[PDB]
Design a protein around this nucleic acid. Sequence first.
RNA 1: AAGAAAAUGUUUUU
RNA 2: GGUGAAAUUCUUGGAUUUAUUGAAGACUAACUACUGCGAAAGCAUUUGCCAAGGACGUUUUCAUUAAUCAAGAACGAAAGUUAGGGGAUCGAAGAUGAUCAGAUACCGUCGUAGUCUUAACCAUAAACUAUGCCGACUAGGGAUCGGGUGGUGUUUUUUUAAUGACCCACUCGGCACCUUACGAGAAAUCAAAGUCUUUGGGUUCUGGGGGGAGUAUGGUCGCAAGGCUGAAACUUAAAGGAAUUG
Lengths: 127, 91, 97, 202, 25, 212, 63
Amino acid sequence: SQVFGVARIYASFNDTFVHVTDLSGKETIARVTGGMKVKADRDESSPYAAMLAAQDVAAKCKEVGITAVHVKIRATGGTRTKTPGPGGQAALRALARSGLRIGRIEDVTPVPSDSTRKKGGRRGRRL
Amino acid sequence: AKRTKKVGITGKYGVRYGSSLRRQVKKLEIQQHARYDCSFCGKKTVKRGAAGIWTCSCCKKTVAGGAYTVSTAAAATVRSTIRRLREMVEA
Amino acid sequence: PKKRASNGRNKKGRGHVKPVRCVNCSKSIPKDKAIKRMAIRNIVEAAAVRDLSEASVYPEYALPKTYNKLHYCVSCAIHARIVRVRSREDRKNRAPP
Amino acid sequence: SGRGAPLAKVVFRDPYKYRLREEIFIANEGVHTGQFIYAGKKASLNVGNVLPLGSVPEGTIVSNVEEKPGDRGALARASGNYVIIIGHNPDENKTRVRLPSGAKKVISSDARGVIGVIAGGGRVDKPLLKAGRAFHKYRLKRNSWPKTRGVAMNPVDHPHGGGNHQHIGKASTISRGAVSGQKAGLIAARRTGLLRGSQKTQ
Amino acid sequence: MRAKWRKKRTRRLKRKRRKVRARSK
Amino acid sequence: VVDPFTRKEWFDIKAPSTFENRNVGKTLVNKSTGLKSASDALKGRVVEVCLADLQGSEDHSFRKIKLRVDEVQGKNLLTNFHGMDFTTDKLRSMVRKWQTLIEANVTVKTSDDYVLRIFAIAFTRKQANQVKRHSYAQSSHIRAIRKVISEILTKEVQGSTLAQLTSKLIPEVINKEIENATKDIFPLQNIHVRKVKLLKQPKFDVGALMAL
Amino acid sequence: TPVTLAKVIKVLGRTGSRGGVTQVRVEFLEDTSRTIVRNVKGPVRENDILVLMESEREARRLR
RNA sequence: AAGAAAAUGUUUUU
RNA sequence: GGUGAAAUUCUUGGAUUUAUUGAAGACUAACUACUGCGAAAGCAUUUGCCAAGGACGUUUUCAUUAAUCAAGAACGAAAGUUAGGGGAUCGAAGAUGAUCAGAUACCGUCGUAGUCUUAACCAUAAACUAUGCCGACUAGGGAUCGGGUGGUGUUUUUUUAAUGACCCACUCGGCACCUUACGAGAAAUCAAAGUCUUUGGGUUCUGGGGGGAGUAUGGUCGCAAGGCUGAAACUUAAAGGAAUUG
Ligand SMILES: [K+]
Ligand SMILES: [K+]
Ligand SMILES: [K+]
Ligand SMILES: [Mg+2]
Ligand SMILES: [Mg+2]
Ligand SMILES: [Mg+2]
Ligand SMILES: [Mg+2]
Ligand SMILES: [Mg+2]
Ligand SMILES: [Mg+2]
Ligand SMILES: [Mg+2]
Ligand SMILES: [Mg+2]
Ligand SMILES: [Mg+2]
Ligand SMILES: [Mg+2]
Ligand SMILES: [Mg+2]
Ligand SMILES: [Mg+2]
Ligand SMILES: [Mg+2]
Ligand SMILES: [Mg+2]
Ligand SMILES: [Mg+2]
Ligand SMILES: [Mg+2]
Ligand SMILES: [Mg+2]
Ligand SMILES: [Mg+2]
Ligand SMILES: [Zn+2]
Ligand SMILES: [Zn+2]
């Protein structure tokens, strides 16, 4: 009854991606980011920008024919953050409110069994 | 008795060519003239002919090797890689 | 003098402990000395658990949690208020709040 | 003579006449006398075997690689040199390889190569240490040694010749569009000076 | 002045003094 | 100016032969044309779909299944098993402090032609009357438990085909066998087969593909 | 222009660097089974009707 | 969740 | 992309994102602890091989074979040097962008050496518990690691039972911890920093106000950087430790 895709919310810091794709992931549908919705070079990670981007992506999904999305949330991961940005939460809520059905929430943040040497030097960013 | 303190094989070169170059030549000449264990007959009878050729005085087997040593690290790594790929292909 | 009875870390009988990187500034800190806080936070709260439940296609999904162990250097922990400066007598209280 | 890498004499049977055909391979390191060499599409992935590039897995190290199927070996023939299989393209059958210089090349999957690295490696790590040893090295290769510097000549002899001090006089970087007799120095140099930076440009 | 950088400065002075000593004979 | 989704045609994935249910969803691809066939664009796609969505039973909320397309038969993508993995949330929930984590992995060829690597996990637990608050293992028992688990996995694979191993993973009987064979060493609350990785496939063999 | 109104059911507290705004737990007049936290700058009390341009906007604290 | 800048102050005397 | 904000930079030759594969090198997350092993530096994936070791048990053996140790040796983090290999990430130098009054700094993007490995050097760290090693004695308490003994012990199936885990009691050895201090200390604090003017169990090393100075010179080691040994002239009334109130 429902057509399932994948939601693929990448909430980094400084920006957020809402990437709706097919079940396989090869074919993409309306990848829209908060940088496409606001123009300040600093607000890409704003929850308002994330909500606007998610609303546009969900509208395009409903016009293409997608009814529900299996949600995969991820952060920058690797060696950098492992913590979702502020905008992924707003993106998920906006996708839920824009009429799309939501299924199978999953965190796919890339977590190493151990890392390459982290950026910043041993003493880190000294601000 | 010990005849030279540090020059060793390069004592034939006298004071010429510089200490650093004589040191490098010492290292590679020692490798080149060392006697090696035969992988087939189990004896320490493998010596270099020309560069890259290592012949065993017993059992007369000849093996292609490095210029100054029987097996280079590159060839050891290549042997390991080819063994892994071969095991993957046949398994 | 010596501020802390054992040390500003937890290492007795070892000599060396492998370091960990601060999540906030990337400073290199030994694993024992780093301030480690575990986060089991619900993956979607957003004051919107009921909203996601309404939008869901599965009845009683039982949404997951996101797990993340954060390691902080002393400076970053103090600045971000994971830990606070305590009095001489309060420093000796290892129990969590 | 004149070659750093040793050669391996490998005897095959003639499939169409009763006789032996002896071939002169470049010995890969680890190959020994009395060893059986298997050459063909169905040969196993053992050191010394000759296989088409399309029949080997990714990351395989090969030597004496063919640029075209049947040219009998053009790439990775000097001592210690080797080619890595870095990709396959089953349709329009081609194999991507990385050459010793680091260049990426696309070769037909029917081109052949020998498993392993060319023997005699590490040859250039030993200082020649003597003008005489350089003399004997080039005595068996060609008449290209010793080399007189162009600045040490007269103006009739070389572009760099002449002058009351030994100096080039003009930029030694020479255009690719220069003609014969002008191409002395650094031909079509993209840059000069002590190399600062990395290799394998994007 | 930090003792580490004072040590570094003293090392530099020692190398300079040794070099001048060697230049003289 | 392009609107590329008008030239795309929809396919339905008839993913399994044996899990519970054939229909897992749909995918889209460009309309097959002179030089870029839709069948070539497909047949390499991988869909990761929840075992709960396969079986209709919510007790499989973890254990996602990987299925890659092998063939096209009239808008139907027939797939076969490509790998199995637990969910990150479930793995992190199982991993807790004040207990020993046991991880084993084996590489083994299935009965017919398939090469797999099985990743199994276990966790130490306290006894019912235990007072000590961590319940750690002594690492020699850990070696014995790893040996037992490896033997069990080696026996269960290579005596069964890939389909039989799938039909054995779904009811989770290997977990109970590991529990029974390791109970005499430690309780080991949380035996699970956390991952199955497909390392090498045999020749395509559409004949055994068409077993659904 | 989207139309939505709400009624504050609880006052959270003062907010802002200068203390200029106040956080209110506010319940939508239509679909009363829905509550959000909002930031309002003027003087407010309990049981006050406000007008919202957007419905889905979590108002966070102002550092 | 986080949030821009801030160098300097003669000697002796209390 | 990046930041508090920027900018350098990439980008309709399709950047970022997604999917399927593959390669390379590093590393060994979570489990991970006031937990373990080692002489220290250190040591965290599986399995195999090789030798090694502590604690315990012992109605085993030898019988003083022992403690600490100038001279003398083995090992010795990181950085650094030489020659090969390798060079994914980070990244002294360097190149750029911004800030600034200046900013060849913090911040940002690259990036050589280095980071990894083999064969050699180097032999230094806030190499720290700033607490030499061996031995005896002097409080109370609960945990925990390894071994052993005992129990009408709980749970687990073998077939009565037994190994396994667990509970309780005892004991040896260990990393530690809490309380109080008979006592000690300038105090911070200390079960050793106690058994100390009521001063002696054995032994090694080191210091004699602060600078000059780990410098000059000599020797010695090292390829080098430097290491070890190591003054004085001269100058100075303080420098320093702990704690108290502002
Ligand atoms: K930010
Ligand atoms: K000239
Ligand atoms: K590098
Ligand atoms: Mg931006
Ligand atoms: Mg700061
Ligand atoms: Mg202080
Ligand atoms: Mg240390
Ligand atoms: Mg020349
Ligand atoms: Mg010349
Ligand atoms: Mg002349
Ligand atoms: Mg001329
Ligand atoms: Mg000219
Ligand atoms: Mg003043
Ligand atoms: Mg691990
Ligand atoms: Mg342990
Ligand atoms: Mg001594
Ligand atoms: Mg500048
Ligand atoms: Mg090094
Ligand atoms: Mg010292
Ligand atoms: Mg000391
Ligand atoms: Mg003081
Ligand atoms: Zn022999
Ligand atoms: Zn930090």
